[PDB]
Write an enzyme that holds these catalytic residues in place. Structure first.
Site, mmCIF file in Angstrom:
data_model
loop_
_atom_site.group_PDB
_atom_site.id
_atom_site.type_symbol
_atom_site.label_atom_id
_atom_site.label_comp_id
_atom_site.label_asym_id
_atom_site.label_seq_id
_atom_site.Cartn_x
_atom_site.Cartn_y
_atom_site.Cartn_z
ATOM 1 C CB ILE A 1 44.898 36.810 40.858
ATOM 2 C CG1 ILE A 1 43.421 36.971 41.273
ATOM 3 C CG2 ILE A 1 45.832 36.807 42.064
ATOM 4 C CD1 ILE A 1 42.871 35.914 42.227
ATOM 5 N N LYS B 1 42.285 40.681 35.531
ATOM 6 C CA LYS B 1 42.023 42.079 35.165
ATOM 7 C C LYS B 1 41.132 42.270 33.943
ATOM 8 N N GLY B 2 40.413 43.384 33.921
ATOM 9 C CA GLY B 2 39.527 43.765 32.830
ATOM 10 C C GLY B 2 39.445 45.274 32.671
ATOM 11 N N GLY C 1 37.627 46.956 36.461
ATOM 12 C CA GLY C 1 37.063 45.678 36.887
ATOM 13 C C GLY C 1 38.082 44.555 36.971
ATOM 14 C CE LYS C 2 43.353 46.101 38.526
ATOM 15 N NZ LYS C 2 44.042 47.402 38.255
ATOM 16 C CB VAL C 3 39.984 38.962 40.180
ATOM 17 C CG1 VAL C 3 39.863 37.915 41.279
ATOM 18 C CG2 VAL C 3 38.753 38.950 39.284
ATOM 19 C CG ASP D 1 32.096 35.137 27.878
ATOM 20 O OD1 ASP D 1 32.284 35.353 26.656
ATOM 21 O OD2 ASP D 1 31.317 35.814 28.582
ATOM 22 C CE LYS E 1 36.602 34.239 27.426
ATOM 23 N NZ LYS E 1 36.776 35.659 27.899
ATOM 24 C CG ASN F 1 37.066 32.349 32.417
ATOM 25 O OD1 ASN F 1 37.670 33.357 32.881
ATOM 26 N ND2 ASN F 1 36.376 32.390 31.285
ATOM 27 C CG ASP G 1 35.371 35.895 34.613
ATOM 28 O OD1 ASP G 1 34.533 36.837 34.720
ATOM 29 O OD2 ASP G 1 36.610 36.070 34.565
ATOM 30 C CB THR H 1 43.045 35.852 22.645
ATOM 31 O OG1 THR H 1 41.884 36.467 22.095
ATOM 32 C CG2 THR H 1 44.037 36.951 23.091
HETATM 33 O O1 LIG Z 1 42.590 33.387 39.790
HETATM 34 C C1 LIG Z 1 41.519 33.774 39.319
HETATM 35 N N1 LIG Z 1 41.401 34.302 38.098
HETATM 36 C C2 LIG Z 1 42.539 34.383 37.152
HETATM 37 C C3 LIG Z 1 42.235 35.405 36.035
HETATM 38 C C4 LIG Z 1 42.052 34.548 34.790
HETATM 39 N N2 LIG Z 1 42.946 33.399 35.028
HETATM 40 C C5 LIG Z 1 42.714 33.035 36.432
HETATM 41 C C6 LIG Z 1 40.216 33.748 40.150
HETATM 42 C C7 LIG Z 1 39.066 34.424 39.726
HETATM 43 C C8 LIG Z 1 37.924 34.481 40.540
HETATM 44 C C9 LIG Z 1 36.712 34.982 40.045
HETATM 45 C C10 LIG Z 1 36.642 35.439 38.743
HETATM 46 C C11 LIG Z 1 35.430 35.818 38.209
HETATM 47 C C12 LIG Z 1 34.249 35.693 38.926
HETATM 48 N N3 LIG Z 1 33.147 35.918 38.233
HETATM 49 S S1 LIG Z 1 31.541 35.824 38.551
HETATM 50 O O2 LIG Z 1 30.725 36.841 37.800
HETATM 51 O O3 LIG Z 1 31.201 34.573 37.836
HETATM 52 C C13 LIG Z 1 30.918 35.411 40.132
HETATM 53 C C14 LIG Z 1 30.791 34.098 40.561
HETATM 54 C C15 LIG Z 1 30.254 33.827 41.819
HETATM 55 C C16 LIG Z 1 29.832 34.869 42.645
HETATM 56 C C17 LIG Z 1 29.962 36.193 42.219
HETATM 57 CL CL1 LIG Z 1 29.482 37.577 43.168
HETATM 58 C C18 LIG Z 1 30.530 36.465 40.987
HETATM 59 CL CL2 LIG Z 1 30.596 38.163 40.573
HETATM 60 C C19 LIG Z 1 34.287 35.268 40.242
HETATM 61 C C20 LIG Z 1 35.510 34.810 40.743
HETATM 62 N N4 LIG Z 1 37.925 33.763 41.678
HETATM 63 C C21 LIG Z 1 39.033 33.154 42.135
HETATM 64 N N5 LIG Z 1 39.296 32.464 43.242
HETATM 65 N N6 LIG Z 1 40.475 32.097 43.244
HETATM 66 C C22 LIG Z 1 41.073 32.464 42.115
HETATM 67 C C23 LIG Z 1 40.203 33.172 41.410
#
Ligand SMILES: O=C(N[C@@H]1CCNC1)c1cc(-c2ccc(NS(=O)(=O)c3cccc(Cl)c3Cl)cc2)nc2n[nH]cc12
Length: 271
Positions: free
Chosen positions: A23, A25-26, A27-29, A125, A127, A130, A143, A155
């Protein structure tokens, strides 16, 4: 083998999940369902080679971490899966939001920013990419840095001017980003936007802000102040969240009911 703080589950292994879709990507989710209580989670996998305990970052409008674990090459963070989708997916359907709707979203973002700034954290960041919406309709930010050209289009840019010309920045960048996110909810496009990238960066850095005529004097004063090029003159420089909290535009917000989710969201995403 980083200790990963106290959020560590020494029993968890990626085998405990079913990974549906990547869902982010960069290190991805990834989207994954737990093989116990068949609950949907979002797992952020990083990868060791990318060289601060924290994780007591609990706010109603920020993602929650359930637990974290590691393989010996990939780093996994089991986070809340947010159902309602991106906020600006809803902005695309409607072109722009009304002031009550935008006030609710900017109020939920401002309180999460104020909370982060009290923990000495800078989002930097913020955006629309996020900013997500939970199943009930509340803002949940992702994020926030807890763990890591083109002639046309390019972008959209929400970074404050000082970040763009690589200068000392502080929590005031988040108040610029709030103004940029708010400007877009009201007008339909990011501030200073041009299809010509060189023109857009020139607007952001050297051109006065163009506030168009169809917003209230309250919203206009807030955007004028939040979108201040000089970080020393920007809204939030003196007493952070407190200046936003008391602004004319947030008059209708009872900040206590807001954090306690006692205010009904102006829209429920069909899930
Ligand atoms: O759908 C998601 N992302 C898509 C990609 C960009 N458009 C949306 C999405 C991301 C994260 C997510 C993304 C980044 C982070 N970043 S983090 O560094 O801020 C962070 C926050 C809280 C605890 C921790 Cl351990 C971390 Cl690393 C965390 C969660 N969580 C989610 N839950 N449900 C959906 C989620």
């Amino acid at each position: 083998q980083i200790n990963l703080g106290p959020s560590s589950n020494p029993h968890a292994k990626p085998s405990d999940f079913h990974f549906l879709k990547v869902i982010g990507k960069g290190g991805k989710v990834l989207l994954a369902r737990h093989k116990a209580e068949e609950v949907f989670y979002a797992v952020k996998v990083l990868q060791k080679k990318a060289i601060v305990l924290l994780k007591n970052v609990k706010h109603p409008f920020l993602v929650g971490l359930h637990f974290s674990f590691q393989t010996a090459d990939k780093l996994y963070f089991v986070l809340d899966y947010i159902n309602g989708g991106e906020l600006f997916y809803h902005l695309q359907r409607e072109a722009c939001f009304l002031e009550p709707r935008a006030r609710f979203y900017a109020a939920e973002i401002a309180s999460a920013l104020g909370y982060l700034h009290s923990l000495n954290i800078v989002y930097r960041d913020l955006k629309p990419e996020n900013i997500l919406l939970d199943s009930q309709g509340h803002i949940v930010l992702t994020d926030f840095g807890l763990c890591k050209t083109s002639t046309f289009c390019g972008t959209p840019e929400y970074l404050a001017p000082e970040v763009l010309h690589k200068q000392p920045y502080d929590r005031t960048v988040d108040w610029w980003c709030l103004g940029a996110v708010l400007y877009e909810m009201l007008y339909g496009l990011p501030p200073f936007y041009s299809r010509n990238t060189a023109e857009m960066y020139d607007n952001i850095l050297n051109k006065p802000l163009q506030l168009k005529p169809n917003i209230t004097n309250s919203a206009r004063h807030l955007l004028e102040g939040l979108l201040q090029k000089d970080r020393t003159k920007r809204l939030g420089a003196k007493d952070d969240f407190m200046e936003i909290k008391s602004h004319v535009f947030f008059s209708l917000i009872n900040w206590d009911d807001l954090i306690n989710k006692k205010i009904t969201p102006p829209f429920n995403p069909n899930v």
